[PDB]
mmCIF file of C-alpha atoms and ligand atoms in Angstrom:
data_model
loop_
_atom_site.group_PDB
_atom_site.id
_atom_site.type_symbol
_atom_site.label_atom_id
_atom_site.label_comp_id
_atom_site.label_asym_id
_atom_site.label_seq_id
_atom_site.Cartn_x
_atom_site.Cartn_y
_atom_site.Cartn_z
ATOM 1 C CA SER A 1 -14.938 4.830 -26.413
ATOM 2 C CA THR A 2 -18.127 3.118 -25.301
ATOM 3 C CA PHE A 3 -20.211 5.957 -26.438
ATOM 4 C CA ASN A 4 -18.795 7.820 -29.419
ATOM 5 C CA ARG A 5 -20.715 11.033 -28.191
ATOM 6 C CA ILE A 6 -22.379 12.033 -24.853
ATOM 7 C CA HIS A 7 -25.017 15.065 -24.850
ATOM 8 C CA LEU A 8 -25.465 16.280 -21.299
ATOM 9 C CA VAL A 9 -28.511 18.685 -20.814
ATOM 10 C CA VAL A 10 -28.870 20.719 -17.558
ATOM 11 C CA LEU A 11 -32.380 21.562 -16.978
ATOM 12 C CA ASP A 12 -31.578 24.461 -14.610
ATOM 13 C CA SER A 13 -32.854 24.324 -11.085
ATOM 14 C CA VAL A 14 -35.033 21.190 -12.007
ATOM 15 C CA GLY A 15 -34.705 19.610 -8.246
ATOM 16 C CA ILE A 16 -36.406 16.433 -7.074
ATOM 17 C CA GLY A 17 -36.710 17.118 -3.446
ATOM 18 C CA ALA A 18 -34.749 18.392 -0.443
ATOM 19 C CA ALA A 19 -31.196 17.229 0.169
ATOM 20 C CA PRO A 20 -30.064 15.416 3.276
ATOM 21 C CA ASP A 21 -28.183 18.912 4.348
ATOM 22 C CA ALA A 22 -31.025 20.979 2.990
ATOM 23 C CA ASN A 23 -31.170 22.804 6.508
ATOM 24 C CA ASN A 24 -27.829 24.563 6.322
ATOM 25 C CA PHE A 25 -29.377 26.407 3.454
ATOM 26 C CA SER A 26 -32.024 28.942 3.494
ATOM 27 C CA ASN A 27 -34.522 31.138 1.776
ATOM 28 C CA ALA A 28 -35.709 34.389 3.450
ATOM 29 C CA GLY A 29 -34.370 33.010 6.668
ATOM 30 C CA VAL A 30 -36.509 29.736 6.191
ATOM 31 C CA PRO A 31 -34.247 26.650 5.948
ATOM 32 C CA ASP A 32 -34.725 24.696 2.718
ATOM 33 C CA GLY A 33 -35.494 21.197 4.303
ATOM 34 C CA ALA A 34 -39.111 21.306 3.350
ATOM 35 C CA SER A 35 -38.460 22.102 -0.593
ATOM 36 C CA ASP A 36 -39.307 19.918 -3.506
ATOM 37 C CA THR A 37 -39.117 21.438 -6.779
ATOM 38 C CA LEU A 38 -40.820 18.671 -8.909
ATOM 39 C CA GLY A 39 -43.220 17.320 -6.200
ATOM 40 C CA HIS A 40 -44.485 20.615 -5.370
ATOM 41 C CA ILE A 41 -45.235 21.493 -8.741
ATOM 42 C CA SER A 42 -46.895 18.239 -9.477
ATOM 43 C CA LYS A 43 -49.344 18.539 -6.635
ATOM 44 C CA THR A 44 -50.303 22.215 -7.065
ATOM 45 C CA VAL A 45 -50.643 22.771 -10.719
ATOM 46 C CA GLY A 46 -49.978 19.363 -12.347
ATOM 47 C CA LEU A 47 -47.074 18.079 -14.394
ATOM 48 C CA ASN A 48 -47.428 15.954 -17.448
ATOM 49 C CA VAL A 49 -44.028 15.097 -18.823
ATOM 50 C CA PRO A 50 -45.006 11.402 -20.381
ATOM 51 C CA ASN A 51 -41.548 11.552 -22.430
ATOM 52 C CA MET A 52 -39.475 11.889 -19.343
ATOM 53 C CA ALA A 53 -41.655 9.329 -17.321
ATOM 54 C CA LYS A 54 -41.251 6.979 -20.313
ATOM 55 C CA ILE A 55 -37.385 7.139 -19.679
ATOM 56 C CA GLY A 56 -38.229 6.792 -16.079
ATOM 57 C CA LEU A 57 -38.490 10.185 -14.288
ATOM 58 C CA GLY A 58 -41.233 8.676 -11.793
ATOM 59 C CA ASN A 59 -39.002 5.714 -11.181
ATOM 60 C CA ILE A 60 -36.478 7.752 -9.378
ATOM 61 C CA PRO A 61 -36.630 6.914 -5.665
ATOM 62 C CA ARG A 62 -38.271 9.362 -3.522
ATOM 63 C CA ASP A 63 -40.283 9.158 0.096
ATOM 64 C CA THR A 64 -43.369 10.041 -1.694
ATOM 65 C CA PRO A 65 -44.216 9.607 -5.444
ATOM 66 C CA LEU A 66 -44.398 12.758 -7.964
ATOM 67 C CA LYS A 67 -48.328 12.866 -7.817
ATOM 68 C CA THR A 68 -48.828 13.051 -11.608
ATOM 69 C CA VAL A 69 -45.486 11.381 -12.839
ATOM 70 C CA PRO A 70 -46.255 7.564 -12.324
ATOM 71 C CA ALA A 71 -43.962 4.904 -12.444
ATOM 72 C CA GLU A 72 -43.008 3.221 -15.631
ATOM 73 C CA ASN A 73 -42.691 -0.643 -15.505
ATOM 74 C CA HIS A 74 -40.945 -0.784 -18.907
ATOM 75 C CA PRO A 75 -38.610 2.114 -18.982
ATOM 76 C CA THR A 76 -36.399 3.190 -21.882
ATOM 77 C CA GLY A 77 -33.531 4.543 -20.123
ATOM 78 C CA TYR A 78 -31.690 4.358 -16.511
ATOM 79 C CA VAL A 79 -32.632 6.872 -13.694
ATOM 80 C CA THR A 80 -31.476 7.797 -10.386
ATOM 81 C CA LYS A 81 -31.112 11.174 -8.395
ATOM 82 C CA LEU A 82 -27.804 12.753 -7.682
ATOM 83 C CA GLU A 83 -26.816 14.795 -4.265
ATOM 84 C CA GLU A 84 -24.594 17.751 -4.353
ATOM 85 C CA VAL A 85 -21.523 17.520 -2.116
ATOM 86 C CA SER A 86 -20.257 21.298 -2.474
ATOM 87 C CA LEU A 87 -20.863 23.827 0.263
ATOM 88 C CA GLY A 88 -22.985 25.918 -2.195
ATOM 89 C CA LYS A 89 -26.165 25.899 -4.175
ATOM 90 C CA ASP A 90 -25.324 28.447 -6.874
ATOM 91 C CA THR A 91 -25.282 27.862 -10.450
ATOM 92 C CA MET A 92 -21.628 27.771 -10.796
ATOM 93 C CA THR A 93 -21.112 25.608 -8.007
ATOM 94 C CA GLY A 94 -23.667 23.068 -9.219
ATOM 95 C CA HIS A 95 -22.252 22.908 -12.594
ATOM 96 C CA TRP A 96 -18.372 22.881 -11.548
ATOM 97 C CA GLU A 97 -19.342 20.011 -9.616
ATOM 98 C CA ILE A 98 -21.140 18.221 -12.279
ATOM 99 C CA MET A 99 -17.719 18.372 -13.939
ATOM 100 C CA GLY A 100 -16.013 17.057 -11.075
ATOM 101 C CA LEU A 101 -14.894 19.800 -8.673
ATOM 102 C CA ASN A 102 -15.588 19.923 -5.054
ATOM 103 C CA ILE A 103 -16.248 23.434 -3.862
ATOM 104 C CA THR A 104 -15.915 24.186 -0.441
ATOM 105 C CA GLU A 105 -15.442 28.151 -0.573
ATOM 106 C CA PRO A 106 -18.862 28.800 -1.756
ATOM 107 C CA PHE A 107 -19.395 32.040 -3.646
ATOM 108 C CA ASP A 108 -21.415 34.339 -1.649
ATOM 109 C CA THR A 109 -24.674 35.784 -2.750
ATOM 110 C CA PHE A 110 -26.130 39.116 -1.541
ATOM 111 C CA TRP A 111 -29.876 39.519 -1.420
ATOM 112 C CA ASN A 112 -29.630 42.711 0.735
ATOM 113 C CA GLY A 113 -27.057 44.057 -1.323
ATOM 114 C CA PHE A 114 -23.140 44.404 -0.871
ATOM 115 C CA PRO A 115 -21.709 44.841 2.706
ATOM 116 C CA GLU A 116 -20.464 47.831 3.788
ATOM 117 C CA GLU A 117 -16.520 46.862 3.587
ATOM 118 C CA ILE A 118 -17.004 46.455 -0.109
ATOM 119 C CA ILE A 119 -18.918 49.545 -1.008
ATOM 120 C CA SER A 120 -16.689 51.630 1.187
ATOM 121 C CA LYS A 121 -13.599 50.152 -0.448
ATOM 122 C CA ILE A 122 -14.369 50.915 -3.903
ATOM 123 C CA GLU A 123 -15.989 54.246 -2.854
ATOM 124 C CA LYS A 124 -12.210 55.060 -1.776
ATOM 125 C CA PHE A 125 -10.575 53.728 -4.476
ATOM 126 C CA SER A 126 -12.949 55.370 -6.957
ATOM 127 C CA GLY A 127 -13.334 58.812 -5.379
ATOM 128 C CA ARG A 128 -17.239 58.213 -6.267
ATOM 129 C CA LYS A 129 -19.802 57.597 -3.901
ATOM 130 C CA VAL A 130 -21.747 54.644 -4.634
ATOM 131 C CA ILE A 131 -25.874 55.106 -4.786
ATOM 132 C CA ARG A 132 -27.136 53.043 -1.715
ATOM 133 C CA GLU A 133 -30.660 52.708 -2.963
ATOM 134 C CA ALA A 134 -29.417 50.811 -5.873
ATOM 135 C CA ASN A 135 -27.047 48.401 -4.084
ATOM 136 C CA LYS A 136 -29.616 45.372 -4.037
ATOM 137 C CA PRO A 137 -30.861 42.660 -6.581
ATOM 138 C CA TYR A 138 -32.000 44.742 -9.347
ATOM 139 C CA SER A 139 -32.984 44.460 -13.008
ATOM 140 C CA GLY A 140 -29.738 45.842 -14.742
ATOM 141 C CA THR A 141 -31.914 47.747 -17.410
ATOM 142 C CA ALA A 142 -34.419 49.270 -14.849
ATOM 143 C CA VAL A 143 -31.535 50.270 -12.392
ATOM 144 C CA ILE A 144 -30.250 52.350 -15.290
ATOM 145 C CA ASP A 145 -33.492 53.801 -15.912
ATOM 146 C CA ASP A 146 -34.190 54.254 -12.249
ATOM 147 C CA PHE A 147 -30.921 55.912 -11.127
ATOM 148 C CA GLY A 148 -29.293 56.849 -14.671
ATOM 149 C CA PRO A 149 -30.517 60.607 -14.190
ATOM 150 C CA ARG A 150 -29.205 60.940 -10.719
ATOM 151 C CA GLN A 151 -25.809 59.307 -11.958
ATOM 152 C CA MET A 152 -25.603 61.740 -14.844
ATOM 153 C CA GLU A 153 -26.165 64.736 -12.462
ATOM 154 C CA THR A 154 -23.823 63.511 -9.471
ATOM 155 C CA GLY A 155 -21.309 60.880 -11.197
ATOM 156 C CA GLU A 156 -22.271 58.411 -8.262
ATOM 157 C CA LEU A 157 -21.407 54.910 -9.195
ATOM 158 C CA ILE A 158 -24.644 52.422 -9.743
ATOM 159 C CA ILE A 159 -23.323 48.923 -8.170
ATOM 160 C CA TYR A 160 -26.130 46.248 -8.029
ATOM 161 C CA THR A 161 -26.357 42.357 -8.240
ATOM 162 C CA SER A 162 -28.647 39.738 -9.081
ATOM 163 C CA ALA A 163 -29.729 36.197 -7.723
ATOM 164 C CA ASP A 164 -26.305 35.079 -8.883
ATOM 165 C CA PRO A 165 -22.852 35.754 -7.222
ATOM 166 C CA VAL A 166 -22.311 38.759 -9.601
ATOM 167 C CA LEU A 167 -21.373 42.451 -8.953
ATOM 168 C CA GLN A 168 -22.233 44.833 -11.729
ATOM 169 C CA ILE A 169 -21.344 48.533 -12.115
ATOM 170 C CA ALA A 170 -23.589 50.554 -14.314
ATOM 171 C CA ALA A 171 -21.848 54.040 -15.394
ATOM 172 C CA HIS A 172 -22.908 56.395 -18.129
ATOM 173 C CA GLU A 173 -20.144 57.008 -20.479
ATOM 174 C CA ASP A 174 -20.195 60.752 -20.555
ATOM 175 C CA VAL A 175 -19.590 61.292 -16.785
ATOM 176 C CA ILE A 176 -17.507 58.029 -16.007
ATOM 177 C CA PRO A 177 -14.661 57.240 -18.452
ATOM 178 C CA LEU A 178 -14.630 53.841 -19.665
ATOM 179 C CA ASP A 179 -10.797 53.908 -18.550
ATOM 180 C CA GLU A 180 -11.861 54.479 -15.090
ATOM 181 C CA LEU A 181 -15.040 52.091 -14.729
ATOM 182 C CA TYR A 182 -12.477 49.399 -16.039
ATOM 183 C CA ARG A 183 -10.217 50.272 -13.344
ATOM 184 C CA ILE A 184 -12.821 50.394 -10.759
ATOM 185 C CA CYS A 185 -13.878 46.890 -11.847
ATOM 186 C CA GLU A 186 -10.610 45.326 -11.759
ATOM 187 C CA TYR A 187 -10.165 46.702 -8.342
ATOM 188 C CA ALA A 188 -13.500 45.483 -7.290
ATOM 189 C CA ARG A 189 -12.264 41.944 -8.938
ATOM 190 C CA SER A 190 -9.343 41.978 -6.692
ATOM 191 C CA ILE A 191 -11.027 42.480 -3.575
ATOM 192 C CA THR A 192 -13.808 39.983 -4.016
ATOM 193 C CA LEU A 193 -11.519 36.659 -4.106
ATOM 194 C CA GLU A 194 -12.337 35.230 -0.771
ATOM 195 C CA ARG A 195 -15.509 34.964 1.440
ATOM 196 C CA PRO A 196 -17.470 36.608 2.932
ATOM 197 C CA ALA A 197 -17.352 38.535 -0.488
ATOM 198 C CA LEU A 198 -16.417 35.802 -2.992
ATOM 199 C CA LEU A 199 -17.887 36.778 -6.464
ATOM 200 C CA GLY A 200 -17.997 34.470 -9.351
ATOM 201 C CA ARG A 201 -18.365 37.774 -11.702
ATOM 202 C CA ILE A 202 -17.734 41.562 -11.929
ATOM 203 C CA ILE A 203 -19.283 43.167 -15.027
ATOM 204 C CA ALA A 204 -18.521 46.749 -16.190
ATOM 205 C CA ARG A 205 -21.905 47.936 -17.552
ATOM 206 C CA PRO A 206 -21.194 51.017 -19.566
ATOM 207 C CA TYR A 207 -24.238 52.783 -21.293
ATOM 208 C CA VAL A 208 -24.969 55.922 -23.221
ATOM 209 C CA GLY A 209 -28.424 58.024 -23.998
ATOM 210 C CA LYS A 210 -30.657 60.296 -21.886
ATOM 211 C CA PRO A 211 -33.472 59.827 -19.177
ATOM 212 C CA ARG A 212 -36.048 57.371 -19.965
ATOM 213 C CA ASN A 213 -34.181 56.160 -22.891
ATOM 214 C CA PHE A 214 -30.919 54.513 -22.416
ATOM 215 C CA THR A 215 -28.613 52.159 -24.428
ATOM 216 C CA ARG A 216 -26.260 49.691 -23.030
ATOM 217 C CA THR A 217 -22.863 49.801 -25.009
ATOM 218 C CA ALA A 218 -20.508 46.853 -26.269
ATOM 219 C CA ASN A 219 -17.755 48.583 -23.955
ATOM 220 C CA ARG A 220 -18.956 46.080 -21.385
ATOM 221 C CA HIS A 221 -16.078 43.774 -19.960
ATOM 222 C CA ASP A 222 -16.302 40.791 -17.464
ATOM 223 C CA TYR A 223 -13.651 39.654 -14.862
ATOM 224 C CA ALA A 224 -14.910 36.114 -14.044
ATOM 225 C CA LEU A 225 -13.173 33.241 -11.964
ATOM 226 C CA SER A 226 -12.234 30.073 -13.788
ATOM 227 C CA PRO A 227 -12.664 26.892 -12.119
ATOM 228 C CA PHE A 228 -9.774 26.648 -9.599
ATOM 229 C CA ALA A 229 -8.617 23.243 -10.539
ATOM 230 C CA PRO A 230 -8.889 21.376 -14.040
ATOM 231 C CA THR A 231 -12.638 19.640 -14.636
ATOM 232 C CA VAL A 232 -13.345 17.042 -16.820
ATOM 233 C CA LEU A 233 -13.839 19.541 -19.563
ATOM 234 C CA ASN A 234 -10.052 20.089 -19.390
ATOM 235 C CA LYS A 235 -9.276 16.589 -19.227
ATOM 236 C CA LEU A 236 -11.639 16.229 -22.412
ATOM 237 C CA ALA A 237 -9.899 19.184 -24.168
ATOM 238 C CA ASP A 238 -6.514 18.219 -23.207
ATOM 239 C CA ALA A 239 -6.948 14.638 -25.061
ATOM 240 C CA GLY A 240 -8.068 16.160 -28.301
ATOM 241 C CA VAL A 241 -11.728 15.380 -27.492
ATOM 242 C CA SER A 242 -14.087 18.204 -28.530
ATOM 243 C CA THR A 243 -16.220 19.809 -26.104
ATOM 244 C CA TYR A 244 -19.222 21.690 -27.429
ATOM 245 C CA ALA A 245 -21.028 24.287 -25.114
ATOM 246 C CA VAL A 246 -24.699 25.615 -25.468
ATOM 247 C CA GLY A 247 -26.180 28.430 -23.380
ATOM 248 C CA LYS A 248 -24.859 29.614 -20.138
ATOM 249 C CA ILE A 249 -22.185 26.798 -20.171
ATOM 250 C CA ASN A 250 -19.124 29.072 -21.615
ATOM 251 C CA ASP A 251 -19.886 31.857 -19.220
ATOM 252 C CA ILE A 252 -20.097 29.452 -16.007
ATOM 253 C CA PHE A 253 -16.670 27.982 -16.654
ATOM 254 C CA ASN A 254 -15.098 31.159 -18.400
ATOM 255 C CA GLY A 255 -14.402 29.115 -21.244
ATOM 256 C CA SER A 256 -12.198 26.668 -19.551
ATOM 257 C CA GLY A 257 -11.848 23.280 -21.456
ATOM 258 C CA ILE A 258 -14.562 24.403 -24.047
ATOM 259 C CA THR A 259 -13.178 23.753 -27.700
ATOM 260 C CA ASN A 260 -16.556 25.064 -29.163
ATOM 261 C CA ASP A 261 -18.895 27.619 -27.690
ATOM 262 C CA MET A 262 -22.249 27.515 -29.426
ATOM 263 C CA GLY A 263 -23.176 30.723 -27.540
ATOM 264 C CA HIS A 264 -26.140 31.994 -25.354
ATOM 265 C CA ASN A 265 -29.806 30.852 -25.668
ATOM 266 C CA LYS A 266 -32.470 33.315 -26.832
ATOM 267 C CA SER A 267 -34.966 30.860 -24.809
ATOM 268 C CA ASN A 268 -34.994 27.360 -23.862
ATOM 269 C CA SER A 269 -36.682 26.458 -27.137
ATOM 270 C CA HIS A 270 -33.795 28.186 -29.163
ATOM 271 C CA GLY A 271 -31.420 26.430 -26.891
ATOM 272 C CA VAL A 272 -32.867 22.898 -27.942
ATOM 273 C CA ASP A 273 -32.884 24.073 -31.471
ATOM 274 C CA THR A 274 -28.919 24.769 -31.099
ATOM 275 C CA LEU A 275 -28.403 21.586 -29.479
ATOM 276 C CA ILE A 276 -30.022 19.534 -32.435
ATOM 277 C CA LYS A 277 -28.099 21.689 -35.023
ATOM 278 C CA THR A 278 -25.046 20.777 -33.001
ATOM 279 C CA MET A 279 -25.614 16.881 -32.788
ATOM 280 C CA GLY A 280 -26.182 17.415 -36.880
ATOM 281 C CA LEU A 281 -23.000 18.906 -37.415
ATOM 282 C CA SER A 282 -20.719 16.500 -39.774
ATOM 283 C CA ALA A 283 -17.594 17.520 -37.675
ATOM 284 C CA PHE A 284 -18.989 16.420 -34.314
ATOM 285 C CA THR A 285 -17.933 12.871 -34.979
ATOM 286 C CA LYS A 286 -16.799 12.366 -31.494
ATOM 287 C CA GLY A 287 -17.116 14.158 -27.865
ATOM 288 C CA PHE A 288 -19.106 15.918 -25.458
ATOM 289 C CA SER A 289 -21.853 18.402 -25.987
ATOM 290 C CA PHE A 290 -23.075 20.314 -22.664
ATOM 291 C CA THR A 291 -26.301 22.214 -22.618
ATOM 292 C CA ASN A 292 -27.979 24.108 -20.349
ATOM 293 C CA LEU A 293 -31.492 25.488 -20.398
ATOM 294 C CA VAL A 294 -32.037 28.152 -18.011
ATOM 295 C CA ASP A 295 -35.561 29.355 -18.088
ATOM 296 C CA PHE A 296 -36.833 27.122 -15.333
ATOM 297 C CA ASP A 297 -34.560 29.033 -12.992
ATOM 298 C CA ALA A 298 -34.742 32.332 -14.315
ATOM 299 C CA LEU A 299 -38.370 33.015 -15.456
ATOM 300 C CA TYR A 300 -40.233 30.720 -13.052
ATOM 301 C CA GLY A 301 -38.260 29.362 -9.926
ATOM 302 C CA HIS A 302 -37.058 32.793 -8.771
ATOM 303 C CA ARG A 303 -40.265 34.307 -9.459
ATOM 304 C CA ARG A 304 -42.115 31.667 -7.706
ATOM 305 C CA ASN A 305 -44.471 30.970 -10.518
ATOM 306 C CA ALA A 306 -45.359 27.357 -10.400
ATOM 307 C CA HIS A 307 -47.942 27.497 -13.434
ATOM 308 C CA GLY A 308 -44.961 28.741 -15.598
ATOM 309 C CA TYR A 309 -42.734 26.256 -14.374
ATOM 310 C CA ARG A 310 -44.940 23.672 -15.090
ATOM 311 C CA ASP A 311 -45.417 24.999 -18.806
ATOM 312 C CA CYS A 312 -41.670 25.258 -19.212
ATOM 313 C CA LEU A 313 -41.153 21.562 -18.186
ATOM 314 C CA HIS A 314 -44.232 20.382 -20.385
ATOM 315 C CA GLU A 315 -42.615 22.306 -23.300
ATOM 316 C CA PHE A 316 -39.164 20.746 -22.936
ATOM 317 C CA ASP A 317 -40.777 17.426 -22.582
ATOM 318 C CA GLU A 318 -42.761 17.962 -25.844
ATOM 319 C CA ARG A 319 -39.318 18.721 -27.610
ATOM 320 C CA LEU A 320 -37.184 15.606 -26.051
ATOM 321 C CA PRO A 321 -38.439 13.304 -28.699
ATOM 322 C CA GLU A 322 -36.671 15.578 -31.089
ATOM 323 C CA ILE A 323 -33.350 15.654 -29.091
ATOM 324 C CA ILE A 324 -33.649 11.906 -29.124
ATOM 325 C CA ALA A 325 -34.661 11.429 -32.907
ATOM 326 C CA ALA A 326 -31.434 13.306 -33.447
ATOM 327 C CA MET A 327 -29.033 10.876 -31.526
ATOM 328 C CA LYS A 328 -26.770 8.490 -33.157
ATOM 329 C CA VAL A 329 -27.270 4.833 -31.989
ATOM 330 C CA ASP A 330 -23.834 5.203 -29.930
ATOM 331 C CA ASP A 331 -24.679 8.551 -28.403
ATOM 332 C CA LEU A 332 -25.761 8.761 -24.730
ATOM 333 C CA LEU A 333 -27.849 11.620 -23.428
ATOM 334 C CA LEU A 334 -28.068 12.457 -19.870
ATOM 335 C CA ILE A 335 -30.475 14.922 -18.333
ATOM 336 C CA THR A 336 -30.039 16.402 -14.930
ATOM 337 C CA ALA A 337 -29.876 19.530 -12.932
ATOM 338 C CA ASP A 338 -27.754 21.881 -10.703
ATOM 339 C CA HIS A 339 -29.743 22.675 -7.826
ATOM 340 C CA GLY A 340 -33.314 23.047 -7.211
ATOM 341 C CA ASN A 341 -35.567 26.278 -7.203
ATOM 342 C CA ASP A 342 -39.183 25.325 -5.753
ATOM 343 C CA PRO A 343 -41.621 27.890 -7.181
ATOM 344 C CA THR A 344 -43.942 26.789 -4.184
ATOM 345 C CA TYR A 345 -41.425 28.058 -1.310
ATOM 346 C CA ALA A 346 -40.665 31.118 0.752
ATOM 347 C CA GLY A 347 -38.043 33.139 -0.560
ATOM 348 C CA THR A 348 -36.863 34.004 -4.027
ATOM 349 C CA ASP A 349 -33.884 31.723 -4.294
ATOM 350 C CA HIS A 350 -32.682 28.380 -5.218
ATOM 351 C CA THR A 351 -33.344 25.497 -2.922
ATOM 352 C CA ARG A 352 -30.809 22.589 -1.893
ATOM 353 C CA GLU A 353 -32.252 19.563 -3.446
ATOM 354 C CA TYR A 354 -31.180 16.431 -5.065
ATOM 355 C CA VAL A 355 -31.263 16.401 -8.597
ATOM 356 C CA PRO A 356 -32.622 13.965 -11.284
ATOM 357 C CA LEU A 357 -30.608 11.840 -13.476
ATOM 358 C CA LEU A 358 -32.099 10.598 -16.840
ATOM 359 C CA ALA A 359 -29.953 8.278 -19.047
ATOM 360 C CA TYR A 360 -30.785 7.260 -22.486
ATOM 361 C CA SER A 361 -29.088 5.475 -25.744
ATOM 362 C CA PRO A 362 -30.737 3.777 -28.337
ATOM 363 C CA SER A 363 -27.764 1.228 -27.923
ATOM 364 C CA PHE A 364 -29.008 0.409 -24.339
ATOM 365 C CA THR A 365 -29.509 -3.425 -23.789
ATOM 366 C CA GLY A 366 -31.097 -2.722 -20.214
ATOM 367 C CA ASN A 367 -33.025 -0.166 -18.248
ATOM 368 C CA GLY A 368 -34.168 0.795 -14.663
ATOM 369 C CA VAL A 369 -33.157 2.586 -11.824
ATOM 370 C CA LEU A 370 -29.129 3.231 -10.589
ATOM 371 C CA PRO A 371 -28.411 3.623 -6.987
ATOM 372 C CA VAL A 372 -28.408 6.932 -5.690
ATOM 373 C CA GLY A 373 -25.268 9.014 -6.482
ATOM 374 C CA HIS A 374 -23.503 12.145 -6.201
ATOM 375 C CA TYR A 375 -23.075 15.343 -8.981
ATOM 376 C CA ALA A 376 -19.652 14.705 -10.086
ATOM 377 C CA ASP A 377 -20.568 10.896 -10.612
ATOM 378 C CA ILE A 378 -21.747 12.684 -14.293
ATOM 379 C CA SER A 379 -18.086 13.938 -14.643
ATOM 380 C CA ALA A 380 -16.486 10.610 -13.973
ATOM 381 C CA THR A 381 -18.892 8.585 -16.135
ATOM 382 C CA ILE A 382 -17.918 10.981 -19.041
ATOM 383 C CA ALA A 383 -14.248 10.672 -18.242
ATOM 384 C CA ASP A 384 -14.586 6.946 -17.797
ATOM 385 C CA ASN A 385 -16.170 6.935 -21.553
ATOM 386 C CA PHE A 386 -13.497 8.959 -23.198
ATOM 387 C CA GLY A 387 -10.468 7.456 -21.336
ATOM 388 C CA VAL A 388 -9.378 10.705 -19.555
ATOM 389 C CA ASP A 389 -8.697 11.215 -15.718
ATOM 390 C CA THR A 390 -11.596 12.312 -13.369
ATOM 391 C CA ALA A 391 -11.113 15.420 -11.632
ATOM 392 C CA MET A 392 -11.509 16.352 -7.725
ATOM 393 C CA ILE A 393 -14.547 13.805 -7.117
ATOM 394 C CA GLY A 394 -16.821 11.650 -8.540
ATOM 395 C CA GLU A 395 -17.485 8.064 -9.425
ATOM 396 C CA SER A 396 -18.388 6.492 -13.149
ATOM 397 C CA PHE A 397 -21.621 4.696 -13.426
ATOM 398 C CA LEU A 398 -20.586 3.949 -17.050
ATOM 399 C CA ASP A 399 -20.587 0.035 -16.269
ATOM 400 C CA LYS A 400 -24.308 0.108 -15.237
ATOM 401 C CA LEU A 401 -25.159 1.596 -18.596
ATOM 402 C CA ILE A 402 -23.351 -1.037 -20.615
HETATM 403 MN MN1 MN B 1 -28.788 26.771 -11.616
HETATM 404 MN MN1 MN B 2 -30.856 31.113 -10.264
#
């Protein structure tokens, strides 16, 4: 194995400009072809990311340069941008492709709530009406505050969603028995396996308490889809190669091919702490770490907050030298994203964009820019490095790094 360890960090949603097929995707009816997460942030609120620029962020080919991220004539790493092949721009699709799958049946998202077929089906199975005013994207903690009292009186189901392909059912334990909530969720899981209702995850959300003061209970159950084919995580795990997960990674893959889940992040910074700790483990002598830093997407992209997005990027850039200081000489660091989420754009959804790829190792004997590639080339490079099979798609760029 050329690199003894590889650390892949996903800056969730950090796109670097509309993809060739961007107009096949949209935001509140507006096609994605004008989106440009990094570029639009830079030209509106500014963007100071000297540590990523030094690796070569400003060397990645673009029609027009990042306004405030200059090219670097003496870069320390290799950079390029990667194009998504899968027909979805959601988080699960992007990560699964980064690990080598080609998703041609993209998960459905429901900005206007679940269709009548799904709701009507669940209503008939459960014998309970669904509260239609709650069938829409909704803070899980606010929907319970808003319709909890009603549910306590009527026993109606509260079914809601998020920006993700997720269906959640909140049900007060006093009026809706756990056993029943689970059966309903299982039935729900069974009728959402194909488009136009393909759901990544069904979540039972039991809760207790009283009006204006509710508490979610540990009786939560999840019903998630695993990758439909072995990914490079499976290839590594099957070969006895360690796979460490940080952040949303375990959830996204439903644990498939993950030997060491380090758990959810409290925040990006707490995630970077956890990655640094993981890198320092005496047991972690060989293998792969896979970290998702989600704040860019959840707090800033979806909320169309460019100022905050900028700050979040700056704060990651400030911590990047800590990650690098913790690398062994024969470690490789890869930084990328899973789609865009342009905070200057119409809508409040992800945007179909190229994603940056930054590559760094102290053992590098060269630097510069790689040919533009595809998401799954990341998986193939990792597979190549550890001498395991590729999954569905992807081509290694390992030979360019050595
Ligand atoms: Mn994402
Ligand atoms: Mn998102």
